[PDB]
Write a protein that binds this ligand. Structure first.
Ligand SMILES: CC(C)CCC[C@@H](C)[C@H]1CC[C@H]2[C@@H]3CC=C4C[C@@H](OC(=O)CCC(=O)O)CC[C@]4(C)[C@H]3CC[C@]12C
Ligand SMILES: CC(C)CCC[C@@H](C)[C@H]1CC[C@H]2[C@@H]3CC=C4C[C@@H](OC(=O)CCC(=O)O)CC[C@]4(C)[C@H]3CC[C@]12C
Ligand SMILES: CCCCCCCCCC(=O)N(CCO)C[C@@H](O)[C@@H](O)[C@@H](O)[C@@H](O)CO
Ligand SMILES: CCCCCCCCCC(=O)N(CCO)C[C@@H](O)[C@@H](O)[C@@H](O)[C@@H](O)CO
Ligand SMILES: CCCCCCCCCC(=O)N(CCO)C[C@@H](O)[C@@H](O)[C@@H](O)[C@@H](O)CO
Ligand SMILES: CCCCCCCCCC(=O)N(CCO)C[C@@H](O)[C@@H](O)[C@@H](O)[C@@H](O)CO
Ligand SMILES: CC(C)(C)NC[C@H](O)c1ccc(O)c(CO)c1
Ligand code: NA
Length: 286
């Protein structure tokens, strides 16, 4: 009884601390490696840094908070922090997929208009892109949440909003679909379309130089495909719930959300296909 709890509490607190550590280590590495290598300060990696910041925010803030909830069984941090926690969660996924769109666009341009691309893309402009992405993302995630557009009238819903120990995120059907379409599905579709255009013009192509490039593009390809596998199952279930809560077991809907959080750990590992990243990872770790 009370032993079964202690075992679970402490073993979970461990797995959580491990994930926290892996995300936070992995992404600090990426930021520092780009931060301390002129070789690796390309325009494209500015977008990678932005992406790794998003994952960093999942490691320091999203996952710790969510861990305390999973381990201890309730929300211990009050109303305001619960909403702000939810905000940051939605914020991160949105910035992540929007940054992936920028990256696929950056690559499409650089590959079919290398001349137009050169005279257009500068450092001051890649900064503007990155902030515009974070602004759009914060707009679409904070405001509806802090304005309670996500709330429902249900008895269950109000049971939970009054209770300070509840941080369930029970939303209405409108917010569920709007949020999914605006935060995930639309950028997901843009990023697919632009990723297959990029793959067309990739095949339709000094040989050593082109192999090294296509290695980098596949890396980016993997980045995207894995982000899509980690999140697509959750946003599919998010939708289907609105029409039928009986079609998918609750535990799996929770699982799928964690799979999402887990994606924050994967990019630094995947960037180990790069010799340049790998040399900077070792040099840094001292
Ligand atoms: C409290 C929550 C909402 C988190 C707040 C996150 C933002 C304030 C962070 C996340 C991504 C960051 C950006 C990620 C990458 C860059 C690239 C970087 O480009 C450079 O001009 C210097 C890099 C170089 O040339 O070596 C400047 C900071 C900037 C715009 C960062 C500005 C601040 C951002 C938008
Ligand atoms: C809210 C959801 C439904 C929209 C998801 C779309 C975004 C992932 C992408 C699509 C096109 C992208 C835009 C493509 C081009 C630009 C111009 C870009 O470059 C500059 O403005 C620099 C020029 C300067 O120096 O002033 C700023 C970001 C922005 C709006 C990008 C922001 C992110 C956008 C809107
Ligand atoms: C959750 C994130 C949400 C971001 C919050 C919105 C802020 C809007 C962006 C912004 O304030 N800037 C654009 C950022 O590019 C200002 C910068 O231009 C600033 O640094 C300037 O003072 C100098 O560039 C000029 O000397
Ligand atoms: C970018 C995110 C944008 C989401 C914005 C959607 C806001 C829609 C407003 C809304 O739907 N409600 C008001 C909340 O402001 C709640 C109602 O849906 C609900 O309370 C009842 O009418 C139920 O009985 C369902 O029919
Ligand atoms: C084009 C936008 C179509 C409007 C979206 C509303 C669909 C919501 C319908 C719905 O809530 N159910 C399906 C009802 O068939 C489930 C109910 O059974 C529960 O109460
Ligand atoms: C509210 C009750 C929720 C209780 C269940 C919480 C599950 C904890 C989530 C977690 O950390 N993982 C399970 C994820 O389902 C492990 C992941 O790190 C794992 O998926 C990845 O390591 C691999 O997929 C890739 O190597
Ligand atoms: C329920 C909990 C843990 C806050 N998950 C939120 C989930 O990660 C999520 C992320 C992004 C989104 O756009 C939505 C929209 O329903 C939900
Ligand atoms: Na509550």
């Amino acid at each position: 009884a009370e032993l079964l709890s202690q075992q679970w509490e402490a073993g979970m607190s461990l797995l959580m601390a491990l994930v926290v550590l892996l995300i936070v280590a992995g992404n600090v590495l990426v930021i520092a490696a780009i931060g301390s290598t002129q070789r690796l300060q390309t325009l494209t990696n500015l977008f990678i840094t932005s992406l790794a910041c998003a994952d960093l925010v999942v490691g320091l803030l999203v996952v710790p908070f969510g861990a305390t909830l999973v381990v201890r069984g309730t929300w211990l941090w009050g109303s305001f922090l619960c909403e702000l926690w939810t905000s940051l969660d939605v914020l991160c996924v949105t910035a992540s997929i929007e940054t992936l769109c920028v990256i696929a666009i950056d690559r499409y341009l650089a590959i079919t208009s290398p001349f137009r691309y050169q005279s257009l893309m500068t450092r001051a402009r890649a900064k503007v892109i990155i902030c515009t992405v974070w602004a759009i993302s914060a707009l679409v995630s904070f405001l509806p949440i802090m304005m309670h557009w996500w709330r429902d009238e249900d008895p269950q819903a109000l049971k939970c909003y009054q209770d300070p120990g509840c941080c369930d995120f029970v939303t209405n059907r409108a917010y569920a679909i709007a949020s999914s379409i605006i935060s995930f599905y639309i950028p997901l579709l843009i990023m697919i379309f632009v990723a297959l255009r990029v793959y067309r013009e990739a095949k339709e192509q000094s040989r050593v130089m082109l192999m090294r490039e296509h290695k980098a593009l596949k890396t980016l390809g993997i980045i995207m495909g894995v982000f899509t596998l980690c999140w697509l199952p959750f946003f599919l279930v998010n939708i289907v719930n609105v029409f039928n809560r009986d079609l998918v077991p609750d535990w799996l809907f929770v699982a799928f959300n964690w799979l999402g959080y887990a994606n924050s750990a994967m990019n630094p590992i995947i960037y180990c296909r790069s010799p340049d990243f790998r040399k900077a990872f070792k040099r840094l770790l001292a």
